[PDB]
């Protein structure tokens, strides 16, 4: 393996990648270097004999393809089913280090042959010396002899561990050492390949610099290369982590499948001696009944399971150091995770992701409880918030995503909201028409502007935008739905600036939970975050704001989202019904929610309260003759309703009484009454209500 590793280093600055180790070593010119990056070399051979790179557009495309191919090759893994779960084997581990490289896929050999095959020195175990002292003798009664035998039993159990621990130490010293050596050799190859790719890129950039191109474009290309170097470093670190995990799991499963049985076999030949000695000692005791002796023998005998101490989780926690815990704690996927607190007239807004982004905000800003915490409230015109960080410069090869909650209290003229543009390069967001617009522009003129509709004011929206440059895929979600899946294969460097500005521009807005991630996100992640953020024990109106008592509301049924219930007098009684199609102009009824603790303002789940309807201050009661909901002018006779809501329907609530959900009823001569339903023939969506601010 060391020969293969040394074959990947070179001194010439004009070398060339090759896959034939023998050809590389036999090279007299020393112009070849051995590399296992199949995709990168294939791509390089494909463009070979093509038009020379002269325009910055060609250079950007070339660099993007090189980065994509390098990342695909280095991070390649294949999942296989092992006894110890599932292992993410490294496909290229064979070509590097020349292990199981005889023929066919490396994974194929690794499956038809144990992980023990990787190391070149197996069968290193040695049986330790065992001294099992026999029980000494004086007679004694069963009451006292029992404690003695119990102590001997415990001592033997402890000795059987001392041995298990000795075998574990043998495994660590003789078997895990080889796997750690393999890890060290593998992570040295990754750095060698990274150095090779970086040297190739630098050579190409140097060649390009000797061309007829403006200095500004050359500086932009140099900055893009600098950022792509960090991207390649991140990819290589991911590969290192994969190698580490794979080989550690391989070593643990090697212990499970290659050492533990031998330890069991060795002790199986030793438990017999202990059992025989105990039986002899018991039979040598006179003051005991034969049945007592039989019971004691049945108690003080060791079965196989009596010396089985394997615990796969203990081994995993045994090879975990404080450094690993620190790395796990210091590992984050956020370049900005806003944290806002009101405190006591000491409002603090800052990044807590660990990247310490410089935040400059005016004192005019305020903080309100938007969805699940304090939210920036830009009310005064010409209010600006800026976040500074080098990583925000983006570049050519880097995937990221923005995520936040927005509420617009204004109207719908065009108005900028968030931007990181420098003249033309960068990305922008702005209200236009009755919706938002997302614009991304590169420094070569290519644009991509998407219009996201249904962002009308007075509603809470959850914006999640993702840019994945590995697939050249742009994902935009609103709430919990996928709006766009465009392709950005023609979007080149977007190197813009180190600061992104958030502005209001005469439109007051709540912004909450702003977050910037250094990676693309999945639909499952967006759905999970959207539905977990809203699970906060608060009932919300249709808008999305917290529902509160004593506020005037209008009541809608989820099935009919444009019909507001109104009162109807029938048989000298008043019931709530739905407006008919013809008479859909009547003003809807207005409601009020009362509570036992009148001090309480914001509604919470499972809260018990009384529904107040507005001249005589009516109250809700449940008729005992037809089960419809009628209105009574007395709080004493009004029922105590329980308020709740469904997790997956956040903005709609449910009423309950005696564990029975209130719901609508089938048509009845141009009416749809509010009832306490028990029949199963009514769809379960009919017992979900919504309250709209009036």
């Amino acid at each position: 393996p060391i020969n293969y590793l040394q074959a990947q280093n070179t001194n010439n600055e004009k070398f060339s990648l090759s896959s034939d180790f023998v050809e590389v070593v036999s090279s007299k010119d020393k112009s070849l270097v051995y590399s296992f990056l199949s995709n990168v070399m294939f791509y390089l051979d494909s463009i070979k004999d093509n038009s020379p790179i002269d325009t910055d557009k060609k250079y950007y495309l070339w660099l993007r393809e090189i980065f994509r191919n390098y990342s695909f090759d280095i991070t390649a893994t294949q999942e296989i089913n092992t006894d110890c779960g599932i292992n993410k084997v490294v496909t290229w581990f064979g070509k590097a280090l020349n292990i199981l490289n005889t023929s066919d896929s490396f994974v194929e050999e690794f499956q038809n042959l144990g992980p023990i095959s990787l190391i070149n020195k197996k069968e290193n175990l040695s049986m330790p010396i065992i001294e099992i002292y026999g029980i000494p003798m004086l007679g004694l009664p069963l009451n006292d002899l029992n404690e003695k035998l119990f102590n001997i039993y415990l001592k033997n159990i402890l000795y059987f561990k001392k041995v298990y621990f000795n075998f574990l130490d043998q495994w660590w010293t003789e078997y895990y050492s080889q796997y750690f050596d393999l890890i060290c050799m593998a992570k040295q190859s990754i750095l060698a390949q990274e150095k090779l790719i970086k040297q190739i890129i630098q050579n190409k950039l140097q060649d390009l610099f000797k061309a007829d191109i403006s200095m500004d474009k050359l500086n932009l290309m140099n900055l893009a290369t600098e950022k792509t170097f960090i991207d390649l470093s991140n990819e290589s670190q991911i590969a290192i982590n994969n190698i580490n995990d794979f080989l550690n799991k391989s070593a643990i499963c090697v212990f499970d499948t290659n050492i533990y049985p031998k330890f069991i076999s060795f002790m199986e030949q030793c438990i017999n001696s202990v059992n025989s000695n105990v039986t002899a000692f018991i039979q040598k005791c006179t003051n005991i009944t034969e049945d007592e002796k039989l019971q004691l023998i049945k108690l003080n005998t060791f079965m196989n399971i009596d010396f089985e101490f394997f615990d796969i989780q203990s081994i995993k926690d045994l090879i975990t150091s404080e450094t690993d815990l620190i790395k796990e704690e210091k590992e984050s996927d956020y370049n900005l995770f806003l944290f806002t607190l009101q405190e006591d007239n000491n409002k603090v807004i800052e990044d807590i992701s660990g990247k310490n982004t410089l935040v400059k905000y005016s004192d005019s800003i305020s903080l309100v409880y938007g969805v699940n915490g304090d939210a920036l409230y830009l009310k005064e015109p010409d209010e600006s918030v800026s976040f500074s960080n080098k990583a925000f410069e983006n570049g050519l090869t880097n995937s990221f995503s923005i995520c936040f909650w927005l509420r617009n209290l204004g109207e719908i003229i065009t108005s900028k909201l968030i931007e990181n543009k420098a003249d033309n390069c960068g990305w922008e967001i702005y209200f236009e028409n009755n919706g938002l617009v997302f614009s991304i522009v590169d420094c070569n003129g290519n644009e991509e502007n998407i219009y996201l509709s249904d962002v009308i004011s007075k509603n809470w929206y959850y914006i999640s935008i993702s840019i994945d440059r590995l697939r050249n895929q742009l994902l935009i979600f609103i709430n919990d739905k996928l709006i766009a899946n465009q392709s950005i294969e023609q979007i080149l460097n977007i190197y813009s600036s180190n600061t992104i500005s958030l502005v209001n521009e005469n439109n007051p807005i709540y912004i909450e939970g702003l977050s910037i991630l250094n990676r693309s996100i999945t639909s499952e992640e967006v759905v999970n975050n959207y539905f977990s953020y809203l699970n906060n024990s608060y009932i919300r109106d249709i808008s999305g704001e917290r529902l509160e008592y004593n506020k005037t509301y209008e009541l809608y049924n989820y099935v009919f989202p444009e019909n507001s219930l109104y009162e109807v007098t029938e048989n000298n009684n008043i019931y709530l019904s739905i407006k008919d199609t013809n008479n859909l102009n009547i003003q809807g009824a207005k409601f009020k929610l009362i509570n036992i603790d009148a001090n309480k303002q914001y509604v919470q789940k499972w809260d018990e309260g009384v529904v107040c309807l507005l001249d005589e201050e009516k109250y809700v009661d449940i008729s005992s003759e037809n089960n419809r909901i009628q209105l009574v002018n007395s709080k004493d006779t009004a029922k105590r309703i329980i308020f709740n809501n469904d997790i997956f329907m956040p903005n709609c609530l449910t009423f309950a009484y005696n564990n029975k959900y209130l719901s609508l009823s089938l048509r009845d001569r141009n009416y749809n009454w509010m009832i306490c339903n028990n029949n199963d023939n009514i769809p379960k969506a009919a017992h979900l209500w919504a309250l709209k601010g009036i």
């Binding site: 006894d83 499948t257 796969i312 995770f337 607190l341 006591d344 697939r471 392709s487 977990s532 603790d597």
Partner: protein
């Protein structure tokens, strides 16, 4: 409102419900039929439909009628009066089943009220007329003739039994039910010979019986035809651009023209195949017909045929039918909203998919899905087979889960397979220039380019009043359900009227065509490859080969597409000693060869199945070379057998008007932009329709072919095993013990997993092809049209620059026409689940909700609660018995199954640590004759033992440390999962793998079929175990699935105490801090603060045991703050406002905090209950950690409505550890991931019987 009558075919004629009807097609040729009025305006005639068909066509012949169905013929059917009565009673039962739910009642009410208009195109607008074959039908009263109004007439099946149809009456090549008027509609239907289908497109995991074939419910078919009846009655059965199939190549399926009505009726993705332009054309045609109808209604003054008709009554009836609106003066007008709602409900509301979902029935996923041969239902009148309420899927018979009632493999006693002798199919004989016959239904379906409208190329004139029209092919079914009235009766006019005199009508003529077409082709494709994997039944000694040509040459050779090692092993011959091992290994290798995938990360696709090309050789010779490399190099176009021409019309330029009124010229520009958005979506819809009807069908056919190939391989392997077993001698066979049912089940499970992977891969490929090779071409022309429109708008503005005082408009146009409307596919689109013994709580009793009807007997010695926790004690009657159905059990041979539950074990008695260490007691047993599985508990371990028939024993356990200062497992709820497969047995605790063992030596395990929950052994009288959420799965669970289930089962609205039980109000507690596990709180002797002391440790007798006391320190208590919610439930919920009090001597003091403190930390102020302005007394309980945990956080707030947080309660230390409130913690909790070791994490310990000094 709707009543189902009862009668028999032999009842005497009463001329009111039983009549001598004259069907319209008799053309005045006598031949009356005995007709029965099942419902108002609906009649049933149990007789064969002989109108148009020749009598000789009823017998099977070499001809065929339709080229897409497996025809079945039986002239003897419906030949005796008894058969007629059975048919009539079956119809009654089906109608009752339809009316059993609100949706069916609404459909029937709409059918009844939808009486045909009293006229047609050949009538003057100012008069009615009933002497029409599409309005009135004659009846005989003499033992001469009268006329009666009717809506629907149901006949018996025609020559083809399993081919139901609906027919409308046309006169002089004109149909009155396609022109708004409506007319009498006939049906040919048969409830016995229903169709069969498959759910290859639906994934249900590794289910043994999934994808085994399902048979349709006759009620659903009847409703499907009734939808056509409704469309015809309402006069909206219009004809437009059909989906003509292409028949230029040889591998392309042939079919008759498909109208949009059928796809609309089916529902699902089918309506997406109709372009939005065709949708708008149909909408406009229907609207024009309705306008004609309303004009007729307004212009009607008198009636000619029957003067006794009350014109006002019929006008009101038609107004109700068409949802017209009557003005104050009296004129009838059309409301756009009402008409739109009616049209959408009729076309997209009443659909087969919606009806199936509402009635809980299974049906075909898509109109173009493959169809299997039909079957004959044994008896539809046996309530033990077909109930009105639940149909086939009867819950009582344990047939409700996964539509088991409709499964061919499960409900084998409810149907009979049809003999292939009577089946007639349209076949293609492909002969190489030997001759293989292929059913036409198995070929690819590709619609011709002439089936799509190019109306997007026409110019549009934009005006100030122009409106954006967008028809959404969808309608909420719940709104339709809630619109039904089940009380109000009908007030229809009398059905009787004057006798018919005009018999002019056009009777259809049907003729058979040859069922065989011979063609010559030298191409070896999907069909040739599939044929090579079949062998004649005569051949017994077969052998697998990797050479397609070799397989095609020798009958005894069978082509295969798996690894060479699998081929070699399958052909290996072994002695009887190793025969069972060989069978096991080959079955496992078959399951492993399939299930093979490679991850894809460069395509926006997840995994790729490499062996599709070898199996099918579809496309550009996919078999040759490395399939994965070819895919990575050339996209998914390689798989397609035919790259289709894409129709992308050039959008016509707009022609705006010149309105001098700034306002009426500025609205025009916005109208133009809205119309442009409309054109964008119309283009997207056209592209999606082309993709669905030309590309996706090929992928579905590929999926079907792969399923067929896998089934062929499984059948060949089974035949090989049977042959080799038969080769062995009688003595060897007696020595050998093998169950072919287990082999078949394992093969089916492997096939199902492989089909799941293939389905995911193919769906990804089709979606990627749509997004990559189709959309951008249309987007290019859309951008070109946008530029053209921008230029046109700019000169329009310049030409009107003198008017419209315009910079704002120019800026608005330049901004709006710069963006692009994103493409949304979802507009056009539409738990482990391998569980068998899910035990849950219903009402003071345990039941099995798995759906297999396990019999549970719970004895009086078991305590149960609403939290699904049951306790097993030492009492003789603390026992639970579960008897499982013999059909649903775990595989005896390959032993793939899992068991999951939550458990709580008390703490060892301090004095009795010898019995604790030595005594093992079983808690669950499933053993019959010393074979099976069991779960026992030897102190400090949880053993799961497995014993085979011979007596071999394999055990896997889990030991939790008892020396730990604070154990996380001693007597706290924890989640145990055990998994077993053919090779290894693993045990996971709380989602983390804890141990495994190799059970390769296991021979065979017999399931006892009787699970006993009971503590058995030498247990002490004080022993007791708590269990919850016991469940068994019939497959090997993955780590990810176990972790997800652990997370799901660990989520609850309330909070948990130290033991894991719900947190409750007014319950004495002790406080435990995660960050200071070794510390407790004691009230200060003098100061009003709580000092922090160190927990005690066991130092009594034994060095083998060590633990720290828990029942020490101040006894805390949580008191409800507002007492707003009901006092019935005392459980504490997240984010509740509470008082954290504690008992000091006989008083109850409260924990306060200083309203204003400078330093970050500040000692708490414990003092008696009071009210003051110098301290806050409101505490909120939160749970910041997302992962499961029993900890919680306490926050101080100025007030319930206040948004200012004071700080988090915790402990810090400069030694002198103090019980403080810190503002620093407020940030640390938000630093993901949450640090479980923080000092703000708290747990509450109430006194429990499971913990002792």
């Amino acid at each position: 409102p709707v009543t189902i009558n009862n009668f028999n075919y032999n009842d005497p004629i009463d001329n009111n419900n039983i009549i001598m009807m004259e069907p319209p097609f008799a053309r005045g040729t006598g031949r009356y039929y005995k007709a029965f009025k099942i419902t108002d305006r609906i009649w049933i005639i149990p007789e064969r439909y002989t109108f148009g068909y020749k009598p000789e066509d009823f017998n099977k012949s070499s001809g065929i009628f339709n080229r897409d169905v497996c025809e079945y013929y039986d002239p003897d059917y419906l030949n005796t009066n008894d058969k007629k009565n059975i048919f009539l009673q079956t119809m009654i039962k089906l109608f009752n089943r339809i009316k059993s739910k609100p949706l069916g009642e609404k459909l029937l009410e709409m059918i009844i009220n939808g009486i045909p208009y009293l006229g047609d195109r050949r009538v003057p607008l100012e008069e009615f007329n009933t002497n029409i074959a599409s309005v009135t039908v004659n009846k005989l009263i003499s033992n001469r003739k009268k006329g009666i109004f009717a809506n629907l007439i149901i006949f018996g099946p025609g020559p083809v039994l399993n081919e139901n149809e609906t027919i409308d009456i046309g006169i002089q090549n004109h149909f009155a039910s396609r022109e708004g008027f409506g007319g009498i509609m006939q049906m040919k239907f048969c409830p016995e010979y229903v169709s069969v289908f498959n759910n290859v497109q639906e994934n249900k995991g590794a289910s043994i019986f999934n994808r085994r074939g399902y048979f349709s419910d006759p009620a659903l078919i009847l409703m499907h035809q009734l939808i056509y009846v409704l469309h015809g009655l309402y006069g909206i059965k219009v004809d437009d651009l059909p989906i003509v199939p292409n028949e230029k190549k040889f591998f392309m399926q042939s079919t008759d023209a498909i109208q949009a009505e059928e796809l609309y009726t089916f529902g699902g993705q089918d309506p997406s195949i109709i372009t939005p332009s065709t949708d708008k054309s149909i909408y406009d045609k229907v609207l024009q017909n309705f306008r004609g109808i309303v004009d007729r209604l307004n212009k009607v003054l008198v009636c000619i045929s029957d003067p006794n008709i009350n014109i006002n009554i019929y006008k009101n009836k038609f107004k109700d039918k068409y949802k017209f609106v009557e003005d104050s003066e009296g004129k009838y007008s059309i409301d756009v909203e009402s008409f739109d709602k009616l049209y959408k409900s009729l076309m997209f509301g009443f659909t087969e998919t919606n009806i199936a979902e509402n009635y809980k029935i299974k049906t075909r996923a898509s109109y173009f899905s493959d169809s299997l041969p039909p079957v004959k239902i044994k008896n539809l009148l046996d309530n033990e087979i077909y109930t009105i309420e639940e149909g086939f899927n009867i819950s009582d018979k344990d047939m409700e889960k996964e539509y088991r009632g409709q499964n061919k493999a499960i409900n084998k006693q409810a149907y009979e397979e049809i003999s292939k002798e009577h089946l007639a199919v349209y076949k293609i004989q492909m002969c190489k220039s030997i001759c293989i016959d292929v059913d036409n239904e198995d070929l690819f379906f590709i619609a011709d380019k002439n089936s799509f409208s190019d109306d997007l190329s026409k110019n549009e004139r934009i005006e100030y009043n122009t409106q954006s029209n967008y028809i959404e092919n969808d309608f909420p079914i719940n709104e339709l359900i809630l619109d039904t009235d089940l009380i109000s009766k009908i007030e229809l006019p009398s059905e009787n009227t004057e006798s018919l005199t005009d018999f002019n009508v056009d009777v259809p003529v049907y003729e058979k065509q040859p069922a065989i077409k011979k063609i010559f082709t030298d191409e070896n494709t999907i069909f040739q490859y599939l044929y090579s994997q079949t062998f004649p039944l005569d051949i017994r000694d077969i052998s697998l080969t990797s050479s397609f040509d070799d397989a095609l040459l020798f009958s005894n050779k069978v082509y295969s597409f798996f690894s060479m090692d699998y081929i070699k092993t399958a052909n290996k011959v072994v002695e009887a000693g190793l025969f069972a091992g060989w069978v096991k290994q080959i079955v496992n290798d078959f399951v492993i060869e399939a299930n093979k995938s490679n991850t894809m990360d460069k395509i926006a696709i997840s995994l790729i199945v490499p062996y599709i090309g070898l199996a099918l050789n579809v496309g550009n010779e996919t078999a040759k070379g490395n399939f994965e490399n070819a895919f990575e190099i050339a996209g998914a176009s390689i798989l397609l057998e035919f790259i289709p021409e894409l129709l992308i019309p050039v959008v016509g330029a707009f022609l705006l008007e010149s309105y001098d009124n700034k306002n009426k010229i500025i609205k025009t520009i916005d109208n133009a932009l809205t119309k442009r958005n409309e054109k964008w979506s119309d283009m997207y819809g056209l592209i999606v329709a082309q993709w669905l009807s030309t590309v996706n069908t090929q992928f579905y056919t590929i999926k079907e072919g792969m399923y067929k190939a896998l089934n062929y391989q499984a059948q060949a392997l089974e035949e090989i095993i049977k042959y080799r077993y038969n080769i062995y001698s009688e003595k060897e066979k007696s020595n050998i013990n093998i169950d072919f049912n287990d082999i078949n089940s394992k093969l089916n499970e492997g096939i199902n997993q492989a089909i799941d992977n293939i389905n995911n891969f193919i769906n990804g490929c089709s979606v990627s092809y749509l997004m990559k090779k189709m959309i951008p071409l249309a987007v290019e022309k859309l951008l070109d049209f946008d530029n053209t429109l921008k230029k046109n708008l700019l000169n329009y503005i310049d030409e009107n620059k003198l008017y419209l005082i315009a910079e704002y408009e120019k800026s608005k146009v330049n901004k709006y026409l710069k963006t692009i409307m994103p493409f949304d596919l979802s507009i056009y689109t539409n738990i482990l689940n391998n569980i068998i013994l899910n035990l849950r709580y219903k009402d003071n009793n345990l039941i099995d909700l798995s759906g297999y009807g396990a019999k549970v007997e719970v004895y009086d010695g078991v305590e149960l609660n609403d939290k699904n926790q049951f306790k097993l004690t030492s009492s003789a009657n603390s026992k639970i018995r579960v008897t499982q159905n013999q059909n649903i059990i775990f595989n005896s041979v390959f032993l793939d199954f899992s068991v999951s539950f939550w458990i709580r074990i008390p703490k060892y008695k301090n004095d009795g640590i010898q019995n604790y260490i030595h005594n093992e007691y079983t808690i669950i047993n499933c053993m019959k004759n010393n074979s099976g599985w069991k779960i026992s508990i030897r102190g400090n371990r949880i053993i799961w033992t497995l014993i085979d028939i011979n007596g071999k024993t394999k055990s896997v356990f889990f030991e939790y440390n008892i020396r730990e200062d604070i154990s996380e497992y001693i007597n706290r709820w924890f989640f145990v999962t055990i998994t077993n497969n053919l090779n290894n047995a693993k045990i996971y605790i709380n989602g983390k793998l804890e141990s495994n063992t190799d059970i390769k030596d296991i021979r065979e395990v017999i399931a006892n079929g009787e699970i006993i929950f009971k503590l058995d052994g030498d247990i002490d009288r004080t022993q007791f175990i708590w269990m919850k959420y016991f469940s068994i799965f019939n497959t090997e669970l993955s780590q990810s699935n176990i972790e997800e289930r652990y997370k799901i089962q660990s989520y609850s609205e309330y909070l948990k105490d130290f033991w894991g039980n719900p947190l409750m109000y007014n319950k004495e507690y002790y406080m435990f801090n995660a960050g200071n596990k070794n510390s407790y709180i004691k009230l200060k002797k003098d100061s009003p603060v709580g000092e922090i002391l160190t927990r005690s440790k066991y130092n009594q007798n034994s060095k083998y045991i060590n633990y720290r006391d828990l029942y020490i320190g101040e006894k805390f208590i949580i008191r409800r703050k507002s007492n707003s919610q009901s006092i019935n439930d005392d459980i504490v919920r997240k984010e509740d406002y509470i008082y954290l009090d504690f008992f000091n001597l006989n008083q109850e003091w409260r924990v306060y905090t200083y309203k204003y403190f400078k330093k970050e930390e500040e000692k708490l102020f414990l003092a008696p209950i009071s009210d003051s302005d110098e301290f806050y007394n409101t505490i909120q309980i939160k749970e910041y950690d997302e992962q499961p945990t029993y900890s919680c956080q306490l926050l101080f707030k100025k007030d319930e409505e206040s948004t200012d947080e004071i700080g988090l309660i915790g402990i810090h230390r400069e030694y002198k550890d103090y019980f403080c409130i810190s503002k620093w913690y407020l940030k640390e909790v938000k630093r993901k991931p949450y640090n479980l070791k923080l000092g703000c994490n708290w747990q509450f310990i109430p006194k429990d019987e499971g913990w002792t000094e």
